Structure formats: C-alpha cells, structure tokens
Design a protein around this ligand. Structure first.
Ligand SMILES: NCCCC[C@H](NC(=O)[C@@H](N)CCCNC(N)=[NH2+])C(=O)O
Ligand SMILES: NCCCC[C@H](NC(=O)[C@@H](N)CCCNC(N)=[NH2+])C(=O)O
Ligand code: MG
Ligand code: MG
Lengths: 354, 354
C-alpha cells in the first residue's frame, strides 16, 4: 500500500466549558493533527494531545517529534507491515507517546481501509457499544448538581466526578449528587492522586454505601505500594491511571499481589493502539478490567480509542468524553453518540469525514 | 473474504528415524490436515499434531473437534475478522489446542494471502532467519556421536540432546559430545522432567563448564516451585516447556520471582498463533527469551511456527526440526533450510505448495 506523504499541523481548540482538576485548570487545548496519504490516494488520520505532567511530553516536544524532516524514514513504507512500523515508531519516538500515537492511529486507519472494514472489525470485535461517562470537574455542591442535570438531559447514564482531597467537600458533593440522581446515572470518582491512606479507607466506605462503581487513582503515581497494602476487595474497586503508562507498568501492577482491579488506558499515555493492545493482553490474563479514557482531544483520537476499546474482550468501562466540550473540531464522524452510548459507523477504517 | 469450504483428513507419516524420549519411544506419527477454501478460490492450510501427555488432547478428540458437523459455524465467516474468529475457536474448541491451531494456522494463511504478503510481514518482521537445533534422542554414547556427525554433515550448527535422568550416562554423553564437536556446534539439553533438585545443580555445573546454552524443563511440569528456589543466574539458563501451555502459564512463570529465563512455545500446546502471540507479549515485557519448538509435524505447521517466530522481537531460538525425519509429507515450501538456518520463502501467506 505504500505511504506517499505526511502532513502535520497545530490546531487550537477552545473549550465551551472550562473546568478544574486537582492542582490545575483548563480553558483550552492544542492538538497536533496528522495526515498520512497513500500512493493510491487514501488518507489516514491521527491526532496528538500530549500530557506533560503524566508522560513528560511537552507540546513543543510533541511537535518536534512530528517535524517533516524527522519523518522521512516512513516515506514509501508499506502499511501492510503495520506491526513492524509500530515497533519502529517506539524506537524513533521513544519520549513522545502522544506524537507516536497520532502516527499509530493513522496507520491503523489506513490498514483497515486497505482491508475494507471498520477498524474495530479488523482488530476483531468484542463489543457493539458501551456507556461513556462525562466529566464533572472540581466545583461547589450547587454547581455540581447543576452540571449533573445538564448531562442527564443530554442522555448520559454515567458521571465521572473529580475529587480534590478535601474530605468534607468531596463527601458532601457525593451524598447530595447520589440523592439528586435518584438512580438515574451511576457514578465513578477520580481523586487524582490527592488522597492518603486513612482518607481512602473512609472514601471507600462512602463509595460502597452510595454504590459508586470505582475509585480512580487515589494515591500518588509512585505510591503503588500503598495500593498493595489495602485489602484485596478494596483494590478491586480501584483503577490505575497516572500509575499506568505502558505495558511495563501494566505488568508491574498486575503482578501478584496485584495493585488494582481496573486499568485506565489512554493512547496519549502509551503511544498508540499497538502498545494499548499489549496492555490489554496483560490485563485480560491477570483478570483486570479495562477502562478506555482520554485527554481533551479531537474526535479523531477519541474514535481511534473507541475502535480499540470495542475490540478488547476485557473492555468494561469507557471514559470517552474528551471531544464533547470542544468549541470546534477538524473532523466529523468516527463514532456515534446515542443515549449515552458510544458506537462506531459502518465506514471502513476510523470512519472519519474531512 | 468469506470461508466457503472446510476439509479435514488423517495422514499417517512413518519416521525415517525412530527415537526415544524419557519415558516414551516414538516410531511414527499421525497428523490431521485442514483445508480452508475461500469463496474466491484461495486455499488455507493447517496441521494438527496433538500431544496427549502434555495437553490432554488425544488423536480421537482432536479428530472429533474437526468433524465437518462441528465446523458449521465457520461457513460464510469473513477471514478479515480473524482475531474475533480466533476468540471463537477458543470458546468452541477449548479442550483441543492442536485442532484449534490447525484452524488458526489456515486462517492466518488466508488473511496474509488476502493482503498479498508472506504471513511474517503481516505480523511485522523481527528477523530474517535463525539457526534451528536438530534432535538426538536417548541412546548410548557411540550412537550419539554417530548421529551428531550425521547432523553436522547436513549442515546443522545446533544440537538438542535428550537426557534421561541417569547422571552417569547423561554426563558421559555430554562430555564426549563436547570433545567430538570442535566448536562445530553448540549444544542445548532436554531432561524432560527427569531431574531432581540436587542433580540439576550438578547438571548446571557441567553445562557451564561445557558451554551448553541451556537446560529445558529439568523438573516435573508441576514443580514450578523448585525453579523459583534456584539462584536467579541458574533460572536464566532454564527453559520452560511442559510447564508452559498458554498465556495463563506464561504470566504465572513470568511474575516475580520469575521461574525461568526462556519459554518454549509450541502451537500444539497454546492453540495457534493467536494465543502464541499473547505469550510473546508477556515474555517480552518480562524479559523472557522465546524459543519456538514443535512435535513431529508436517511442514505445514512447522512453517506456521516459523512465520510467527520471525515476527516476534523476543524470539531467540528455534527448535523446528519436527518435519525433517518424516518419510513423506503432504506439502512443500513454507520454509527454506540453509546451513542450519530456517527462513521463509517470498510467497504470500504461509507460502506452502500443494
Ligand atoms: N489531563 C486531562 C484531565 C482529565 C483526565 C482524566 N479525566 C477525565 O474525565 C477525562 N475524560 C478528561 C478529558 C475530557 N474532557 C473534559 N472536559 N472532561 C483522568 O482520569 O485523569
Ligand atoms: N512430548 C513432546 C514430544 C517432543 C519432545 C520435544 N523435543 C524435541 O526435540 C522436539 N523438537 C520434538 C520434535 C523432534 N522430532 C524428531 N523427529 N526428533 C521436547 O522439547 O519435549
Ligand atoms: Mg485519574
Ligand atoms: Mg522439554
């Protein structure tokens, strides 16, 4: 199939809804858009959203790694050799997982078009659709319930709530919300490293009481020893996010005694579908459930993540809302949202429309 | 691309060279041959050689799992959906890994032909070629040297020597063999679960002194705890065979403290290329070396093992001699032997010829 050409550009996306995360805040996001064209005319798409506090990858570095000069070795390479290409991406873009993921997506986009089916069918289909959470950032009780209701009306059945580590505020938000929802959506929480050992045992008791489904990354990334020191049943209700970048992390967390029961895979953390799939093999073997999450991102990479997600039997949760609050985007299609569930189209490849 | 027909038959192959394994003694072999034709005329090939003592799969059970009536679910299925098809093989033939492999093989053969490249390039190429060992069964000192010399003459640079557990005979054979070869070939050994703990330490001292590359399965398959009680440096020179069936075993042996340093993968154990590649992912992350082994088998499955092996960066060794001593076969091609080294032809798919 033969790569002819590659274009890379910066795109600025302001958010319709700015929000707060633990020791942070976000009004807008930059992505890198990648276009890979085939000798015979086909177009693969990819998108990068580097997260520096997690992977160490700056936007400057991401863009650097995608510079036209540094990509020459891809010219004229045969996309049917995709897994070899993915290995070489890992070797030539060792420090830029988001950049690497962008190219990786695009190649998966093209190989599926070559074969003639939606990418998911090519990776083998484990699922037709799944519910996705939408995110509520850090904010006071009234505002929280206010956003909660907006989301219910847009038809979402799952809410992901960010916690700040102040137990008084965190707990009252969760109790009020549980009340206000009256069983209309389930809830998952994300303290984002802000808790401590005694704190989490407390939060976990609430979580059981309120029927919250799991707790995402309660302790600091390096603190996985704190996780293993918890009773096994509590560990099953905890997901690793910032602790989990690639397959090496997956294996280390999965090794007995296992650190947790859920992995949150993000393309921008691991560097594309190929490494994400290695994570899934490890997780499935270890009896660990997969959650597919994201950064603030164009529909392009959300779609890529969805196709991967629906191809893994171990996939259980989706947190795929990264493109919803974008003020504009550079592509349409790739997935369909209906009544809170995410689905792919019947179009070949990623199914994106330019 | 749409499966159209599936045909299955028993073939009886006598050996040109009968041989003894610890507790066993083989004079001939039966294989099941599997032909999958596409609606467009394309032909996939697979071969099953069930090993009952290792997998519990008998020839009868294997044949039964391939009955034309038990295979109806595959008709009309699209081979471009291969990973999904393989997941189903696992559900529908859970107790018959050889039969599963035979179908898995054939399907990979077709997807590769669909794309139009040798299977190995579709899987992404990690290697051009590797040396293979040839096997010397249990037999006295003189006949061992005689067989070694026959093999040197045919150009092999690596010999795999079966040990029986009797140290006086085992050690004498290895010492003599070392002397007879000059540097002409490296030697690897395979006690097949016949050693105890005190004896293995004795064997390992010899192995270091004689420059033998490693020891395959010194202990009973269930005695994994004996491995972990060894110093790490010794564990690195040990390969797992009968202890390793599928990915579940792979993870178990790989998790810290790791039981051994090398996995011996066999399609007839794990159930085909799909599970085999799952083992490879685990092994690579754990820093375990891969060796691809076999039973007495037609070129068909040897070829398939070869494509898979040349596609995994973790592969360090081949023991692929399973089709050499067959008095007849049903196919040609698929791999080329030169000067002890195995390599694949340039033809698409498995590259077999009828
Ligand atoms: N660096 C991204 C911040 C959040 C990451 C993630 N939580 C989420 O809920 C993501 N879906 C956030 C990105 C989606 N966009 C919006 N506006 N919520 C995490 O678990 O760390
Ligand atoms: N129970 C497994 C039977 C084979 C044993 C295998 N040893 C080998 O040497 C393999 N290459 C088998 C094929 C050898 N074929 C001939 N004709 N010598 C093992 O590792 O247990
Ligand atoms: Mg998190
Ligand atoms: Mg063995």
């Amino acid at each position: 199939m033969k790569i002819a050409d590659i274009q890379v550009r910066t795109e600025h996306f302001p958010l319709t809804r700015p929000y707060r995360i633990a020791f942070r805040s976000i009004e807008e996001i930059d992505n890198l858009i990648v276009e890979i064209r085939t000798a015979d005319g086909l177009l693969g798409l990819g998108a990068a959203s580097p997260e520096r506090h997690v992977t160490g990858e700056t936007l400057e570095a991401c863009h650097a790694a995608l510079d036209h000069d540094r990509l020459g070795w891809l010219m004229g390479r045969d996309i049917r050799t995709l897994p070899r290409l993915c290995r070489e991406l890992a070797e030539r873009l060792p420090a830029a997982p988001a950049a690497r993921a962008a190219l990786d997506m695009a190649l998966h986009d093209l190989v599926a078009q070559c074969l003639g089916l939606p990418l998911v069918e090519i990776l083998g289909r484990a699922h037709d659709s799944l519910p996705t959470s939408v995110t509520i950032g850090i904010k006071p009780v009234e505002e929280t319930l206010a956003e909660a209701r907006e989301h219910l009306a847009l038809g979402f059945r799952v809410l992901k709530v960010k916690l700040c580590g102040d137990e008084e505020q965190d707990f009252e938000r969760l109790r009020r919300l549980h009340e206000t929802l009256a069983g209309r959506a389930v809830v998952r929480v994300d303290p984002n490293q802000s808790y401590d050992r005694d704190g989490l045992l407390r939060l976990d008791r609430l979580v059981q009481e309120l029927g919250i489904e799991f707790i995402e990354q309660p302790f600091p990334a390096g603190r996985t020893d704190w996780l293993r020191a918890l009773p096994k049943a509590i560990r099953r209700r905890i997901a690793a996010d910032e602790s989990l970048l690639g397959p090496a992390d997956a294996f280390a967390l999965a090794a007995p005694p296992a650190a947790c029961g859920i992995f949150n895979i993000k393309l921008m953390k691991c560097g594309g579908l190929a490494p994400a799939r290695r994570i899934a093999t490890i997780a499935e073997t270890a009896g660990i459930d997969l959650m597919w999450g994201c950064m603030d991102e164009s529909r392009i990479s959300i779609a890529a993540a969805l196709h991967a997600a629906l191809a893994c039997p171990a996939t259980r949760y989706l947190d795929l809302d990264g493109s919803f609050d974008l003020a504009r985007d550079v592509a349409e299609g790739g997935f369909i949202l209906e009544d809170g569930r995410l689905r792919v189209t019947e179009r070949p490849g990623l199914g994106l429309v330019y």
